[PDB]
């Protein structure tokens, strides 16, 4: 037969993937570690949207109660003790085939549409409803939109707080997208023009945008996830041709 989708088999300890072992289609992050036995360690999108600053306190504590164990506490401490975020953790792809063994096996899609095998029930990317926004001239302009993930930092007088945005746009051109994003993000940008001089932590930018891939306009549908009864509003993209590109930073 025929497939044409690019996957990767994945081993990750089962503590970190608490609702993401149940709802197929999630962003996954690579977190390299100075500990040599788990050199790479894989991170849920919602697991890092915990300490994202965009998320309100109700949603944050709700998914923290979805995300409370010792291993996750140590990993969040490691993530916070990392200086910046975006090149100690990294974008990796989209979840499919949770196995849930002892050390659980995950397939993950690099390119193409999200399906395990036999092409029944082609899954979709699941984005938290708080963490996305579409800054554009006309929303849902004519047809299919490119989905990007933006990491944006913030500095509340002690430390750095990262923030996870997802933009949906008709614009393919990265220059046009960073030009509309500076118009969206100018305020905290000037706050970082104050901060990055006095800072000694090795970072050089305000945020960075990276393409996930294509979506379809009529395939955006609302909903919620629930794990242990915690209703959590999400916006489910349905069919996604995953097309990763390079990180493009902006100051």
């Amino acid at each position: 037969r025929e497939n044409l989708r690019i996957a990767a088999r994945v081993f990750t300890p089962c503590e970190l993937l608490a609702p993401e072992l149940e709802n197929l289609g999630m962003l996954m992050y690579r977190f390299e570690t100075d500990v040599d036995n788990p050199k790479i360690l894989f991170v849920g999108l919602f697991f890092l949207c915990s300490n994202a600053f965009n998320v309100s306190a109700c949603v944050r504590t709700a998914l923290t109660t979805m995300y409370t164990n010792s291993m996750v506490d140590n990993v969040l401490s490691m993530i916070n003790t990392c200086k910046y975020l975006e090149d100690k953790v990294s974008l990796f792809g989209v979840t499919s085939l949770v196995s849930c063994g002892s050390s659980c096996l995950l397939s993950c899609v690099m390119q193409g549409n999200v399906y395990d095998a036999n092409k029944e029930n082609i899954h979709g990317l699941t984005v938290l409803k708080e963490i996305f926004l579409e800054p554009d001239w006309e929303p849902r302009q004519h047809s299919t939109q490119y989905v990007y993930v933006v990491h944006v930092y913030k500095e509340v007088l002690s430390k750095l707080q990262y923030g996870i945005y997802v933009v949906l746009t008709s614009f393919q051109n990265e220059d046009l997208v960073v030009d509309i994003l500076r118009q969206y993000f100018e305020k905290e940008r000037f706050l970082f023009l104050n901060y990055l001089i006095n800072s000694n932590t090795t970072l050089s930018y305000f945020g960075s945008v990276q393409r996930i891939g294509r979506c379809a306009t009529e395939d955006i549908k609302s909903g919620f996830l629930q794990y242990r009864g915690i209703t959590l509003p999400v916006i489910k993209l349905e069919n996604i041709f995953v097309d990763l590109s390079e990180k493009k930073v902006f100051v």
Binding site: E174, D175, L196, N200, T201, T202, S204, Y205, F250
Partner: peptide, 25 residues
């Protein structure tokens, strides 16, 4: 020297930004 690495990285990123201005895809 680590401060020098960080400052040169920041200056390089500013030059990447002004290059991304005048650059065309």
């Amino acid at each position: 020297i680590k401060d020098e690495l960080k400052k040169i990285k920041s200056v390089l990123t500013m030059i990447d930004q002004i290059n991304s201005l005048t650059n065309e895809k």
